[PDB]
């Protein structure tokens, strides 16, 4: 099943890309990369050092100052970003396969990511030359005032394992479109598609040092990427505790930060929702990508009048979800990403039971022989819980949902907002007026009305509260990579003569 | 001279303003406030505790959630902000006097601040109802996509002693215009105008808890203001080390931060500049507000061909600068702000000499009997220095300039950018083309061509590098107080049927 | 009424109150009783020519055009405060001149205050753009400048309101203007010009021409020094104005009213729909731009709806706008009332039914005024002239529809495209309908609202351009692309 | 030239290549030698009527108008790539039809590629706005919709370039269009329509009408189903078009050329100014929209400047646009050349001096073509018809000025307002001048540049509206304010 993807690795680079060259780690260290479907070592790549990271940041600064890219016309930068987009489409099949091999998600999930990635690059390619800044009506006579937008500078970018190429395209596109130099480091356990995308960008051609790729989770590599004085912006997508640590580091040089740290996304279902649609979308929110996608709906809030019927209907569908190899077209859910992540998920099951919650279905590794070698976990539904519980307040980022009941509209909103997170959520009801009222009160970066999962390049994505700082995608996403400069010219300068002559 | 201002204090409140009430500190502690012209204790105000700060933040959260202000129409919020602006103008004389009394700057400097403050409020009042968000052309058929702008939420705001009411208006105006609730804490040594502005805002009328005022530098008050979980944005203007500490704290709850930490602002003078203008503006950049204003030009870069002549002409003017009471119309420069700040300035003079720099004039406290009781420091020019020196790389924020020579345009730019700062700077030359080239290469939030000092509400202000994060003033400043929410409605929802039925 | 003893009677040209160049005057009438209440100057085309040339001179001097946007904003705001300050008197004068109820005039005054305040705050918010030039070593900018000299012609229904929509952005942007209100309703406009002089503007920046003199209209639309002609009024006059503006390739902005549909589905809040159908049809005797004369109601509830509407129409209280009990005043003039009567003759000839009203009220206290009964025409169809043509009177037609699709097809079957409503508790549907209607403004479960924050204007024959909002400000600006080559090199295309 | 054996000869209406309804045709000429090179259909007003009704039907079906903006963008991009792909052939065909040098045609092709690519990227970037409503419990939005059906008339100087300026935004926004190129220069337009069919659009979304048939122009400007008429060409035709559009209150966008000043101060880079004065006057034989026929030079260097310019003008190499040595081709047609000759007769009658040129070249190889010598007219003034009127030919006038102020006053003394330049090493001054010029585009130390990223169009009689940039996109959109009352309450104004 996976052997065609295994073939691709025969030609994939194993090294870092620093300052126009594929290089090993300064100490020759390496890391084994695994396929989560069978836990087999499938590739070995360089494990970079903090000096490698250092050298990349300084190369990115040197290229920035040269102006080769930063002072290129916006139109031409747009054409190059478009050329990356065209590469993604041209190598769509291989890229989708490489992503399924590395992360375990189904091939159709990977193809959908490859479509999004193409559109992300294409969107930024188009936006690149559309806004150079503003002319201001100066309140001072005989002055000309303008705001010019410049690339922010050297940017470090840390991407997560869920999921590599898609989140990388969110950061890379705007950075290249605006003229920044970047240093990217993907998750130590999933570097395959990122290494491939760097090979393709190298084919498109960028001046030396504009793009650099650091691999691994080496000692203090993160520190250097978040704390180096030549960095102007650190953009991190991943876990909350690392995110916080990254921000503390960025403070040492008063460096701009952008964070996206996941969330406990609510899926609110009223008793006047289209029922079968809500059940369908509750499965999709809970179990696409094994519940590991950023948009996952792990917190179901359902109105008390239909709660029992919704629970039975959901549980009945969950038992039919097909687990298996992501390359097998019959598979509906692949495995979770690592031993460590599967272990955290298991332990949250113990906490659930101990707290009084009911594991209504799932909650364990599956039996079947073809899944035994893999990092599989059964899709899980947890009932009879409430907001005071750890399993409701803490995000597990696995194929697991909790179900809480609510009596009124006001209670739904209150419960949905009762979390430290604020990334995304949905409201299901045929009463659109009501759904709009709810949407307006939810503290969430994105709200879906009668849908679940949609994100796209045209609109910004990001969190309120502990889910993040800043936005990716849209004009706002482009803005994270820009800095504003006010240039004021006194066209008729006269002596002030404040001080005695 | 100062007795009319002393009269105003007879009716000024001495307390904090928390949740619609003027209150003492929870432990009844107080702090003596000084006039830097004579070091006399002129007022005693409450010294708040961390619990006071806590209570204000929670009151601000409660008011935010009630919607009284946050859900008010933008137009009406604009009218109230306009009403504050009108108060400032109506009480312009008293406010200017109170500011000269507290900070020591000349009365004309204070009147100019009062004009700026009126225009800041008036600008935000006008901008308040001009942008509600965007409609997006959704890439998904039968979806409606919109971005709605909401107030960011609870905001804490820490203002500096240089200078109180002006920097406070930069933060307050956009916060009220967008519908946020705020908690402000001015510098412990200059709370007078801030207390007055709160009395005036109370007259305009805001729902209980929308605005709160905390006084002092109490134990952990800053920590609570920067680290409390109910805060959505911390905005701090002040010293670099406190700024960094504030950001590290804000990270504990992944809270948005906005910082403005001063700079080492360059004033580049070419040999084809209008000479007398450049000398005049070099004095203004170096010595307005005793060199303590955010826009101060402490780093003069002058072309080698006119360096000796520029130095003599500058030194000759510096000896004529009139020091004195800020209420005496003859005064051209008042005192520095505190014993501590004057001490730091003295010690930088020792470091200058030890490093080999020449104190060409000034560098000490003045003799005169009418200045003896005050915190006066002579306007100072430091020659024969270079970029490698601490006195050139570190900002003193006093009435002191350094003079370095440069041979070429390329050297001017290089030297000007050779600092950890990036707030503001100027270029003087009759060759406008050249001045534009230089302006485009300087890493600075604001660049003046043939001028020095101008900031205004219509344009954003803030720093590159260690001078800050974010912007104040302009549409950008308003944006710091807003959060974006993507609402996506599927107008024709259909079952996805990904999972087996 | 005492107000009139202090009000000027002259034109305002180049900083001076002046009579007509031939001393001609015109009598102004109170439609409530047809009494002459004031006499004002009736300008000549030479007066109009003189104001245009003055506006142009002031514009060129730069005193207003080169003033800082912030300061222009502060003066527009001072005008707004003067409106609020003189709110009562202004309301009374509008009611005297136009006949609408005192309450209608108060609401106008509140709107006018907000219109001026909106543009005052917008004045200094956009100077243009910096462009990222595709040519290396070039700087590219777009500067927004005031469009220049602007002529403004306002209608009689909301004289002061429509005036503020034009005056506010013109002043905010730095243009010089020449305004001419409806010849039958100049009072509040004269008064607002007094208020403006109190604020103080450079000579020629604002000018007021009065009347309907011979070729005054033509000079305002066809003079070569005009950069923009802004007209709100009748479609025939509008077309003529645009043809004239064409002689100098002059920018035009037109608002020509419309045949505005009121769509009522059977799942609408029934009582609400009846209430809003009345409001749509009869606020200001149906002479307001946002009036909903074309009612479309779903067949399932058509009979119930017609009966309820008609029963309510019979209770509408006609009377003096100054009396607290009046719910609808008289129509504006003899000619307009005659037009409304002609339109009733067309309805009859086409075979429609006058379910109620259709004539002048009989009552004694109403005898002397220009009153017309609120009227409902039933049993008509889209092919009839009374459905296709707008009368701008206290009259509504009622047609039925079977489906959503049929309601859209009928509502879009007219030459107009200004505004309309959809009433339905199914918000999903109301939105589908609103996205398909060719109207500048669509209301979902409401009727009439307009405000400074959002643009207003028509698709199709209801206009060209927009007023209010940022788009409204933009009619008064022009873009200039200044491109600077920072490293100019010889091209050497032609042999040396 | 071989290219022509494969090129269509018909119109393109409602997804089909069709002849004229009366089978009439017209002969197309190569201005280099006046040979008939192709024969195409000559449409009737009925054909035009049919395309409009087809564009309207397709627009209403929603196949293109309701397609996602992102997908519309991708198809506009595929058109752009087809331009680059067929760059050589297209350049050769433009040169064949218009006579300009192969190098001029290549630059056009590069520009056209960038125009399409710009709008392709702009398509999905702005859907409208959310408004913060001043009314509580209301949601207010402004949705931007395609304007509808658009008629587009392009000129003969840059047929394909001017076509791309109109086609690109129309397609990007979702409009349906009907285009009619200049009757004497249809070749590249026909070819671009073939390219578009290869990309594939819904039937009726694009339509091509050919010729100058009787009342074809009038139907394109006056038909009631048109929402926007976009015309680039002569000022008289433009005015007539606007008067016609007025009959249905139709939006107009006009670009009518101009009398573009080239201002040369005595502190300009002298050699640069001479070089750019030549370029401004004689690129495309001075028939391009951005041509600088009116030279204003400071008196201090006027004599030196005139002599240098004239000496260079004598060396300009006229010839076949396909030969690498040619620097200027022939003028477009017999009529236009005759107009240029008439204008030389006016210069003489007014007493001006033909310093050089002013007639047809005498040489053998040029005998058969529509050649006109590059010409310089000296000793003229602003009061003369030759200074005030534009000929769009290879001719420039030279006038002197004493001061900055006098240069501004002279440059603005014309009925036009399209583009101009200022040359001076004193950038401060050049900027003062540029801010005072009433021109849509001002170049500082350059001449000619225009690009997709910035708007282009005229003040005064040079146009209404703008093309290129965001403002260009906006002519093809219309705003709709949808206001939703989320808590509707009865008003109860009328007694229950
Ligand atoms: Na892996
Ligand atoms: Na946050
Ligand atoms: Na003090
Ligand atoms: Na920074
Ligand atoms: Na009516
Ligand atoms: Na129209
Ligand atoms: Na010409
Ligand atoms: Na015009």
Tokens coding A227:
């704390």
- CA D474/CA B318 separation, integer angstroms: 57
- Beta strand pairing status for A256-260 and A233-237? parallel
Domain count along chain C? 2
Tokens coding D100:
């300009």
Longest dimension (CA), chain C: 94
| Same domain assignment for residues D354 and D473 | no
* Sheet of strand C228-232, all strands in order from the earlier edge strand to the far edge: C16-18, C11-13, C206-208, C176-180, C149-153, C228-232, C251-255, C463-464
Closest CA to A58 of A19, A17, A88: A19
Q: What is the CATH number of the domain that holds D27?
A: 3.40.605.10
CA distances from C386 to A51, B472, C343, C414 (A): 84, 58, 7, 11
Closest-CA residue of A relative to B485 is A445
User: C interface mutation test: which of A135, A140, A273, A427 has the most C CBs within 10 A?
Assistant: A135
| Same domain assignment for residues A344 and A483 | no
| All residues at 6 or more sequence positions from A463 whose CB lies less than 8 Å from its CB, including other chains | A260, A261, A263, A421, A422, A423, A444, A445
- CA B197/CA B12 separation, integer angstroms: 11
Would you give the DSSP letter of residue C124?
T
H helix or E strand, kind and range, residue B341: helix B339-355
C480 DSSP β-pair partners? C143
Q: Which residues on chain C are in Cβ contact (under 8 Å) with A132?
A: 129-133, 140
Helix, strand and coil percent figures for chain D, each rounded to 5: 40, 20, 40
- Cβ–Cβ of A259/B254 closer than 8 Å? yes
- CA C361/CA B110 separation, integer angstroms: 69
| Same domain assignment for residues B168 and B312 | no
Angle separating helix axes A74-90 and D102-122, nearest 10 degrees: 70
| Same domain assignment for residues D242 and D364 | no
- CA B353/CA B357 separation, integer angstroms: 5
CA distances from C46 to A285, B414, C59, C216, D148 (A): 74, 65, 20, 8, 42
User: What size, in residues, is chain D?
Assistant: 496
- Positions of B marked catalytic: 260, 294
* Residue whose structure tokens are 């039914």: C353
- CA A188/CA A171 separation, integer angstroms: 18
- Cβ–Cβ of B130/C121 closer than 8 Å? yes
CA distance A283 to chain C (A): 25
D153 DSSP β-pair partners? D180, D231
Residues of D with CB under 8 A from a CB of A: 70, 73-74, 114, 117-118, 120-125, 139, 428, 431-432, 453, 470, 486
A272 Cα to the center of ligand 2, angstroms: 33
- CA D171/CA D72 separation, integer angstroms: 7
Neighbours of B4 (CB within 10 A): 12
| Same domain assignment for residues A3 and A91 | yes
- Cβ–Cβ of C121/B144 closer than 8 Å? no
* Sheet of strand A16-18, all strands in order from the earlier edge strand to the far edge: A21-23, A16-18, A211-213, A181-185, A154-158, A233-237, A256-260, A468-469
- Cβ–Cβ of B75/C453 closer than 8 Å? yes
Helix, strand, or coil (residue B423): coil
- CA A420/CA D427 separation, integer angstroms: 56
D252 Cα to the center of ligand 6, angstroms: 9
| Same domain assignment for residues C199 and C345 | no
- Cβ–Cβ of C275/D138 closer than 8 Å? no
Rg over alpha carbons for chain D, rounded to the nearest Å, is: 24
- Beta strand pairing status for C477-485 and C138-146? antiparallel
C256 Cα to the center of ligand 6, angstroms: 10
A462 Cα to the center of ligand 2, angstroms: 9
The partner residue sitting opposite D443, judged by closest CB among C430, C442, C483, is C483
Q: Is B108 exposed, middle or buried (0-12, 13-18, 19+ CB in 10 A)?
A: middle
- CA B270/CA A307 separation, integer angstroms: 77
Helix, strand, or coil (residue D413): coil
Q: What is the resolution of this structure in A?
A: 2.3
CA distance B126 to chain C (A): 4
Tokens coding D381:
């003034």
Q: Is D266 exposed, middle or buried (0-12, 13-18, 19+ CB in 10 A)?
A: middle
CA distance D460 to chain A (A): 24
- Beta strand pairing status for C228-232 and C294-298? unpaired
- CA B452/CA A493 separation, integer angstroms: 10
- Give the ligand whose atoms come closest to the C-alpha of residue B258: 4
C157 Cα to the center of ligand 2, angstroms: 52
Answer for the pair B324, B378: CB distance below 8 angstroms, yes or no.
Answer: no
Answer for the pair C42, C24: CB distance below 8 angstroms, yes or no.
Answer: yes
- Catalytic choice (A99, A180, A294, A378): A294
Expressed as residue numbers, the domain containing D106 is 1-257+452-496
D188 Cα to the center of ligand 8, angstroms: 30
| Same domain assignment for residues B129 and B14 | yes
Q: Which residues on chain A are in Cβ contact (under 8 Å) with C130?
A: 132-135, 146-149
CA distance D442 to chain C (A): 5
CA distance A192 to chain D (A): 29
Task: Please provide residue D415's backbone torsions phi and psi, each rounded to the nearest 5 degrees.
Answer: -85, -10
Answer for the pair B382, B394: CB distance below 8 angstroms, yes or no.
Answer: no
Closest-CA residue of A relative to B137 is A458
| Same domain assignment for residues C64 and C200 | yes
Q: Which residues on chain C are in Cβ contact (under 8 Å) with D242?
A: 242-243, 245-246, 249
| Same domain assignment for residues D235 and D290 | no
Helix, strand, or coil (residue A350): helix
Neighbours of B378 (CB within 10 A): 21
Closest-CA residue of C relative to B81 is C121
Closest CA to D218 of D283, D127, D153: D153
Domain ends where: C451, C467, C482? C451
Answer for the pair B390, B355: CB distance below 8 angstroms, yes or no.
Answer: yes
Categorise residue B334: left if φ over 0, alpha if ψ from -120 to 50, beta otherwise. Answer: beta
B222 Cα to the center of ligand 2, angstroms: 19
Helix, strand, or coil (residue A212): strand
Q: Which residues on chain C are in Cβ contact (under 8 Å) with B119?
A: 70
D294 DSSP β-pair partners? D261, D397
Answer for the pair A183, A155: CB distance below 8 angstroms, yes or no.
Answer: yes
The partner residue sitting opposite C486, judged by closest CB among B119, B144, B433, is B433
- CA D182/CA D184 separation, integer angstroms: 5
- CA C340/CA C346 separation, integer angstroms: 10
Give the environment of ion ligand 7: residues with CB less than 5 A: D 286, 291, 293
* Sheet of strand B256-260, all strands in order from the earlier edge strand to the far edge: B21-23, B16-18, B211-213, B181-185, B154-158, B233-237, B256-260, B468-469
- CA D346/CA A192 separation, integer angstroms: 76
- Give the ligand whose atoms come closest to the C-alpha of residue B375: 3
- Cβ–Cβ of D139/A436 closer than 8 Å? yes
Q: Which chains touch B (3 or more CB pairs under 8 A)?
A: A, C, D
* Residue whose structure tokens are 């990403």: A337
- CA A195/CA C56 separation, integer angstroms: 66
- Cβ–Cβ of D121/A144 closer than 8 Å? no
* Cα C212–Cα C215–Cα C217 angle in degrees, nearest 5: 60
Count Cα atoms within 13 angstroms, Cβ side, for D430: 29
Task: Please provide residue A16's backbone torsions phi and psi, each rounded to the nearest 5 degrees.
Answer: -85, 170
C16 DSSP β-pair partners? C13
Neighbours of C389 (CB within 10 A): 15
Closest CA to C445 of D140, D143, D483, B489: D483
Neighbours of C365 (CB within 10 A): 14
Chain-centre distance of CA A97, in angstroms?
20
Rg over alpha carbons for chain B, rounded to the nearest Å, is: 24
Closest-CA residue of C relative to A145 is C127
Q: Which residues on chain C are in Cβ contact (under 8 Å) with B458?
A: 70, 124-125
| Same domain assignment for residues B425 and B488 | no
- CA A448/CA C403 separation, integer angstroms: 29
The partner residue sitting opposite C122, judged by closest CB among B79, B126, B437, is B126
| Same domain assignment for residues A375 and A240 | no
Neighbours of C63 (CB within 10 A): 16
Q: What is the CATH number of the domain that holds A404?
A: 3.40.309.10
Tokens coding D366:
């040029």
Experimental method for this entry? Answer: X-ray
CA distance B346 to chain C (A): 43
Has A480 been annotated as catalytic? no
Answer for the pair D219, D45: CB distance below 8 angstroms, yes or no.
Answer: yes
- CA D13/CA C490 separation, integer angstroms: 47
Domain ends where: A456, A471, A489? A456
H helix or E strand, kind and range, residue B478: helix B474-480
Tokens coding C386:
């009374």
Domain ends where: A423, A440, A456? A456
- Catalytic choice (C42, C225, C255, C474): C255
CA distance D8 to chain C (A): 35
- CA C355/CA D459 separation, integer angstroms: 54
The partner residue sitting opposite D130, judged by closest CB among B128, B135, B433, is B135
| Cis before A163? omega within 30 | yes
Would you give the DSSP letter of residue C226?
-
- Cβ–Cβ of A475/D125 closer than 8 Å? yes
* Backbone CA torsion sign across B451, B454, B458, B461: positive
Q: Which residues on chain C are in Cβ contact (under 8 Å) with A74?
A: 132, 134
User: B interface mutation test: which of A132, A431, A493 has the most B CBs within 10 A?
Assistant: A493
| Cis before A50? omega within 30 | no
- Cβ–Cβ of A129/D470 closer than 8 Å? no
CA distances from B394 to B303, B348, D236 (A): 22, 9, 69
| Same domain assignment for residues B443 and B497 | no
Write the DSSP string, C264-290.
Answer: E-TTS-HHHHHHHHHHHHHGGGGTSTT
D119 Cα to the center of ligand 4, angstroms: 35
Answer for the pair B372, B39: CB distance below 8 angstroms, yes or no.
Answer: no
Rg over alpha carbons for chain C, rounded to the nearest Å, is: 24
| All residues at 6 or more sequence positions from C48 whose CB lies less than 8 Å from its CB, including other chains | C178, C180, C209, C213, C216, C219, C220, C223
Tokens coding A474:
């849209």
Helix, strand, or coil (residue C463): strand
């Amino acid at each position: 099943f996976q052997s065609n993807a295994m073939e691709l690795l025969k030609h994939l680079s194993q090294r870092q890309y620093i300052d126009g060259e594929w290089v090993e780690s300064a100490n020759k260290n390496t890391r084994d990369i695994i396929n989560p479907y069978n836990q087999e070592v499938i590739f070995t790549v360089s494990e970079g050092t903090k000096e490698d990271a250092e050298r990349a940041i300084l190369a990115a600064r040197r290229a920035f100052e040269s102006g080769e890219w930063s002072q290129e016309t916006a139109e031409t930068r747009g054409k190059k970003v478009r050329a990356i987009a065209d590469k993604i489409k041209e190598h769509r099949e291989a890229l989708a396969r490489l992503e399924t091999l590395d992360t375990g998600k189904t091939l159709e999930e990977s193809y959908a990511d490859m479509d999004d990635i193409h559109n992300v690059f294409m969107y930024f390619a188009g936006l690149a030359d559309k806004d150079g800044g503003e002319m201001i009506d100066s309140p001072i006579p005989d002055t000309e005032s303008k705001i010019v937008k410049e690339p922010v500078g050297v940017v470090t970018q840390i991407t997560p394992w869920n999921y590599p190429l898609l989140q990388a395209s969110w950061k890379i596109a705007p950075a290249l479109a605006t003229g920044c130099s970047l240093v990217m480091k993907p998750s130590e356990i999933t570097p395959l598609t990122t290494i491939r995308v760097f090979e393709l960008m190298e084919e498109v051609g960028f001046p030396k040092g504009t793009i650099n790729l650091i691999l691994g989770a080496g000692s203090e590599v993160g520190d250097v990427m978040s704390g180096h004085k030549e960095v102007d912006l650190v953009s991190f997508t991943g876990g909350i505790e690392t995110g916080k640590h990254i921000m503390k580091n960025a403070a040492n040089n008063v460096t701009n930060i952008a964070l996206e740290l996941g969330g406990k996304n609510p899926n609110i279902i009223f008793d006047d929702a289209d029922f079968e649609l809500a059940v369908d979308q509750a499965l999709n929110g809970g179990y696409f990508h094994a519940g590991q996608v950023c948009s996952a709906g792990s917190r179901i809030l359902v109105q008390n009048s239909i709660k029992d019927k919704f629970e039975q209907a959901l549980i009945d569908r969950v038992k039919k979800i097909k687990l298996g190899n992501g390359f097998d077209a019959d598979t509906e859910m692949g495995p979770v990403i690592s031993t460590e992540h599967r272990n955290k998920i298991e332990s949250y099951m113990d906490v659930a039971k101990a707290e009084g919650a009911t594991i209504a279905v799932g909650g364990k590794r599956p039996d079947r022989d073809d899944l035994k070698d893999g990092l599989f976990f059964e899709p899980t539904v947890i009932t009879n819980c409430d907001t005071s519980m750890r399993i409701v307040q803490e995000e597990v980022f696995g194929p697991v949902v909790t179900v809480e009941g609510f009596e009124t509209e006001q209670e739904a909103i209150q419960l949905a907002n009762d979390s430290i997170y604020g990334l995304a959520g949905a409201v299901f009801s045929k009463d659109i007026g009501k759904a709009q009222r709810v949407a307006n009160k939810l503290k969430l970066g994105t709200v879906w009305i009668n849908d679940f999962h949609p994100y796209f390049a045209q609109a910004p994505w990001g969190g309120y509260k502990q889910s993040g700082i800043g936005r990716e995608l849209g004009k706002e996403g482009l803005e994270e990579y820009l800095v504003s400069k006010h240039i004021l010219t006194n066209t008729n300068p006269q002596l002030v003569n404040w001080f005695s002559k």
